[PDB]
Amino acid sequence: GPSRVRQNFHPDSEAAINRQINLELYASYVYLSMAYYFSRDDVALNNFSRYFLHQSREETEHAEKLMRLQNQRGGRIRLQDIKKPEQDDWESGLHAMECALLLEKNVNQSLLELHALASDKGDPHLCDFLETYYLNEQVKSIKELGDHVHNLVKMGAPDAGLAEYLFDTHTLG
Amino acid sequence: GPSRVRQNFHPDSEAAINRQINLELYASYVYLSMAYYFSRDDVALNNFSRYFLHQSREETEHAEKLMRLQNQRGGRIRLQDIKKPEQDDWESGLHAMECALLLEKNVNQSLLELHALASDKGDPHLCDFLETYYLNEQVKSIKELGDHVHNLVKMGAPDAGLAEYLFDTHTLG
Amino acid sequence: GPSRVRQNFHPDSEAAINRQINLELYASYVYLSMAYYFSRDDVALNNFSRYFLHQSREETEHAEKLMRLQNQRGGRIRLQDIKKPEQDDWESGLHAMECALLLEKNVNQSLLELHALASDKGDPHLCDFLETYYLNEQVKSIKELGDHVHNLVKMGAPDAGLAEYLFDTHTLG
Amino acid sequence: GPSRVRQNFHPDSEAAINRQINLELYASYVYLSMAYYFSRDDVALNNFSRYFLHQSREETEHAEKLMRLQNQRGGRIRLQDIKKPEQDDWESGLHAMECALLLEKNVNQSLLELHALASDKGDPHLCDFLETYYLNEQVKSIKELGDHVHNLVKMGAPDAGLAEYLFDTHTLG
Amino acid sequence: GPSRVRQNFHPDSEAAINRQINLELYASYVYLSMAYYFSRDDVALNNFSRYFLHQSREETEHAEKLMRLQNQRGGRIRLQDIKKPEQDDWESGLHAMECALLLEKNVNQSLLELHALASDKGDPHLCDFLETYYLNEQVKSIKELGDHVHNLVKMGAPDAGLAEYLFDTHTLG
Amino acid sequence: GPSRVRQNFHPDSEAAINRQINLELYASYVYLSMAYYFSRDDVALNNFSRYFLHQSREETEHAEKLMRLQNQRGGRIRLQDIKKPEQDDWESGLHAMECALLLEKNVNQSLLELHALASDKGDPHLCDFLETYYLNEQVKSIKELGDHVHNLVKMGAPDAGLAEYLFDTHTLG
Ligand SMILES: [Cl-]
Ligand SMILES: [Cl-]
Ligand SMILES: [Cl-]
Ligand SMILES: [Cl-]
Ligand SMILES: [Cl-]
Ligand SMILES: [Cl-]
Ligand SMILES: [Cl-]
Ligand SMILES: [Cl-]
Ligand SMILES: [Cl-]
Ligand SMILES: [Cl-]
Ligand SMILES: [Cl-]
Ligand SMILES: [Cl-]
Ligand SMILES: [Cl-]
Ligand SMILES: [Cl-]
Ligand SMILES: [Cl-]
Ligand SMILES: [Cl-]
Ligand SMILES: [Cl-]
Ligand SMILES: [Cl-]
Ligand SMILES: [Cl-]
Ligand SMILES: [Fe+2]
Ligand SMILES: [Fe+2]
Ligand SMILES: [Fe+2]
Ligand SMILES: [Fe+2]
Ligand SMILES: [Fe+2]
Ligand SMILES: [Fe+2]
Ligand SMILES: [Fe+2]
Ligand SMILES: [Fe+2]
Ligand SMILES: [Fe+2]
Ligand SMILES: [Fe+2]
Ligand SMILES: [Fe+2]
Ligand SMILES: [Fe+2]
Ligand SMILES: [Fe+2]
Ligand SMILES: [Fe+2]
Ligand SMILES: [Fe+2]
Ligand SMILES: [Fe+2]
Ligand SMILES: [Fe+2]
Ligand SMILES: [Fe+2]
Ligand SMILES: [Fe+2]
Ligand SMILES: [Fe+2]
Ligand SMILES: [Fe+2]
Ligand SMILES: [Fe+2]
Ligand SMILES: [Fe+2]
Ligand SMILES: [Fe+2]
Ligand SMILES: [Fe+2]
Ligand SMILES: [Fe+2]
Ligand SMILES: [Fe+2]
Ligand SMILES: [Fe+2]
Ligand SMILES: [Fe+2]
Ligand SMILES: [Fe+2]
Ligand SMILES: [Fe+2]
Ligand SMILES: [Fe+2]
Ligand SMILES: [Fe+2]
Ligand SMILES: [Fe+2]
Ligand SMILES: [Fe+2]
Ligand SMILES: [Fe+2]
Ligand SMILES: [Fe+2]
Ligand SMILES: [Fe+2]
Ligand SMILES: [Fe+2]
Ligand SMILES: [Fe+2]
Ligand SMILES: [Fe+2]
Ligand SMILES: [Fe+2]
Ligand SMILES: [Fe+2]
Ligand SMILES: [Fe+2]
Ligand SMILES: [Fe+2]
Ligand SMILES: [Fe+2]
Ligand SMILES: [Fe+2]
Ligand SMILES: [Fe+2]
Ligand SMILES: [Mg+2]
Ligand SMILES: [Mg+2]
Ligand SMILES: [Mg+2]
Ligand SMILES: [Mg+2]
Ligand SMILES: [Mg+2]
Ligand SMILES: [Mg+2]
């Protein structure tokens, strides 16, 4: 102590990165829950399932990149429990997509707060890291989910009998 | 003055070509507006967007071919402001297609007036140019848009929840 | 209720599968922690890191296969918090391997208890599932980790300066 | 209202992006005018023409990327008239290059003002977008045009009879 | 004066870039010295030599990219003497790696001061340039050297007879 | 001391090799300065730039081969500061080429003095090394630069507006 690599890396930044690692792992778990909701025999929308599973894997990648950043900068990873998602039953394709949009906006708000702290601590490496690997990816994800919610709402989800099925077999297929 | 190339090229034809260049640039801009309406998060019909973007690029090509004609004949290009489109909000896939059909018929009427002037001035090169590169392309575009309007109307656009989505993912996909 | 697919699937089996899903997710998290311990600047054994990361990914696969089994049989996945690992600092390559061996034996004991319950409930599909996809894989993993612990101990880990490095660059490389 | 995607996106940023879209479309139009000046029968420098046409197409791409950004962030595109360029007659290869350098510096100043507003509004996504896709491209364009102006001046443009021709057939060829 | 390209480029930034060019050239020279220490007949660690030679070449690239930046922005390169390194005799593989880690942290501190000046002068192009091409590369280099120092220390360098040789023929080979 | 490899290698030869290493590094730096003079926005002769950059890289190679010779013979490299070049502003393509010719003749004179010392000390290995790798390369470089100076002078450099540009785009292109 300190790490022989550590430079210009504030303890508050190190802790905020640890909190962000937990949030990305939590997001991965929410999407995993959603993926296996869509493969229930009474839901059976396999392209919704594959969509959410892919999202889950992406979140794990986001978490891992933060863990690598912690090591690269000489901070120490401190893991915490990954809380279970809010639901096992996600009710419908539309409801899952709306919950996913809210989750992505929440994660985005956390990333923006992290970038603000990094700016406050004069850490341009950390600022650049978030800008390069996180902020644009989050904007793209939010826009994609917004698009999906809009189409499902317009199509008459969740009550219209064909809407989720047609969306499954066209947009997500 | 005159250009050492100029031959059998009436000043009224030169001016009418300048007006047509502006109209084709205006059409390009209308279709650009439409393309980015369809990629709004609250519209999200990406194949409508690609359709209109392609139309926009075609209109720019039409404008450029007239600019090349002006130079080939020894006339002088005189550009004017490109007016903004009538709307940013194009309301629905059906409404955009109806507006596009009206725009194409209006551009066609201008081309027919240009051909009539070229005939009046005994300019068979200009007549041939419009016939070869413009008049049939315009008839094809009008027919395609008419077809698209018909299908959307029959399908129950804009109020029927599935119509624009199914048209997006079948006809324009 | 019941699921139109459910057959010969006891509620106690459904719950025990939910507990096993949590344990496999927990194992994934332990191995993730270990992987990023080995890429600290003050540990720097990249082949230990890759070894544990691969183990982490395998555990996630094991969890997912149980989630698929729950759906296939008409049970309902119920996720719980994934507890953080026992340590962030895993002390040495030998200590991590010893902890991993203990974790695998613990997971094995849980699988054997699950198989015993499935036998008690006359569920041969569930018995076969565990035998085909879990029990032999666990025996192989335990043997591999036992082998690695033995070599590290014989080589003089953790105090012998060359032992972990040579093991990293030969066995795990 | 607001867009279900909108987050951390200030109305002043949304308006400034709309102004920048207009400026990039205006730049595209200036370069289009220049391209077709160089293919007049009394100028006839086809590599100047191709150079400016390529620049025109690049500006349209820059405009489109801002329109996509507006949609991605949940803002609303508002288009305005595209003003005609300052000249149809661009006088000489040197004069066109000097006008293009001034236009690029003016567009750069607008981008720098946009980045300053984005910083003031704590919008790091928008800051990153301009840095990643705009600011370096503008510096490169300004340097290239500066280089071209220098060579043409040194060579004795516009009065030296060989200068524009040799530059056309070597540098731009 | 000023350069016809110069825009938003403060004289203090231009001078700080000149100082950074000298520091990167100095770093190249330190690593060149180290490379040829390791090919002495009484050291004879050819993979240490190749490692440092590669580092030397990278530093020259870093210097050249700053020289290109100076030209792109319209500043004027002003070169100074490149001071000789602190030693010809670098004592051991461990000592060279420790000196290289200190040199990289020193260069990093200079880059962070340059980024701070660029922020103070409202030069986002220069900020982006350092973030994109310098700051992450420096963090990666510091982490790699930290890793190498750790392994050599753990292995018993410099006194343990096998440590530098085994590191040479495994990690650097 | 002595090196177990050293044989027939006089201390005066070892020192003269150290002086020659410094001179070749100095030559590399002169050519680097010249290369980036030619990419200034107010010079903009990219093939002059590439020519000098290649020369710079060759000089570094010449320096490195002497450093390898020092090690092969059991001498000890002793580096000194690399002095900055005589100018940042090299005035014109002709002036740079004339300065480069003078620099190469000066380096040649040093090599001839080194060969004379090696002959005086009865060191045929060192004589052969200079003959095989240095003396003919220097004669070729001097002749090439002489040729380039002649053409630029005949063409009317530096005042004739086309001369440096045409030389850039034909001989160096
Ligand atoms: Cl620190
Ligand atoms: Cl969608
Ligand atoms: Cl329906
Ligand atoms: Cl006529
Ligand atoms: Cl149709
Ligand atoms: Cl419908
Ligand atoms: Cl049952
Ligand atoms: Cl083993
Ligand atoms: Cl040992
Ligand atoms: Cl070994
Ligand atoms: Cl907002
Ligand atoms: Cl140029
Ligand atoms: Cl001339
Ligand atoms: Cl300035
Ligand atoms: Cl290492
Ligand atoms: Cl040893
Ligand atoms: Cl001797
Ligand atoms: Cl020559
Ligand atoms: Cl001349
Ligand atoms: Fe995604
Ligand atoms: Fe990914
Ligand atoms: Fe991925
Ligand atoms: Fe992906
Ligand atoms: Fe994420
Ligand atoms: Fe809880
Ligand atoms: Fe996400
Ligand atoms: Fe920034
Ligand atoms: Fe078309
Ligand atoms: Fe076309
Ligand atoms: Fe086309
Ligand atoms: Fe087409
Ligand atoms: Fe048209
Ligand atoms: Fe108007
Ligand atoms: Fe049209
Ligand atoms: Fe395994
Ligand atoms: Fe597997
Ligand atoms: Fe696997
Ligand atoms: Fe495997
Ligand atoms: Fe497992
Ligand atoms: Fe706990
Ligand atoms: Fe396991
Ligand atoms: Fe069996
Ligand atoms: Fe360009
Ligand atoms: Fe482009
Ligand atoms: Fe392009
Ligand atoms: Fe391009
Ligand atoms: Fe632009
Ligand atoms: Fe006007
Ligand atoms: Fe531009
Ligand atoms: Fe940035
Ligand atoms: Fe490196
Ligand atoms: Fe490189
Ligand atoms: Fe390189
Ligand atoms: Fe490299
Ligand atoms: Fe560097
Ligand atoms: Fe000194
Ligand atoms: Fe470095
Ligand atoms: Fe960036
Ligand atoms: Fe050469
Ligand atoms: Fe060479
Ligand atoms: Fe070479
Ligand atoms: Fe060569
Ligand atoms: Fe040389
Ligand atoms: Fe001096
Ligand atoms: Fe030379
Ligand atoms: Fe001889
Ligand atoms: Fe010889
Ligand atoms: Mg949290
Ligand atoms: Mg009109
Ligand atoms: Mg448990
Ligand atoms: Mg404006
Ligand atoms: Mg200095
Ligand atoms: Mg000297």
What does the model show?
- This is part of a larger assembly, with six copies of chain A (173 residues).
- The longest helix of chain A is centred in the C-terminal third of the chain and has 32 residues, at 124-155.
- By secondary structure, chain A is mainly alpha-helical.
- The first copy, chain A, has helices at 11-37, 46-73, 93-120, 124-155, 163-170.
- Chain A is built from five helices and no strands.
- Chain A has a single domain, classed as Ferritin (Up-down Bundle), CATH 1.20.1260.
- The N and C termini of chain A lie far apart (52 Å).
- Chains in contact: A-B, A-C, A-D, A-E, B-D, C-E, D-E, D-F, E-F.
- The A-C interface holds A 3-5, 29, 32-33, 36-37, 39-42, 64, 67-68, 70-71, 74, 76-85, 88 and C 3-5, 29, 32-33, 36-37, 39-42, 64, 67-68, 70-71, 74, 76-85, 88.
- The complex binds chloride ion (19 copies), fe (ii) ion (FE2) (48 copies) and magnesium ion (6 copies).
- Residues 156, 160-163 of chain D line the site of one chloride ion.
- It is classed as oxidoreductase.
Outline of the structure:
It is classed as oxidoreductase. This is part of a larger assembly, with six copies of chain A (about 170 residues). The first copy, chain A, is mainly alpha-helical and about 170 residues long.
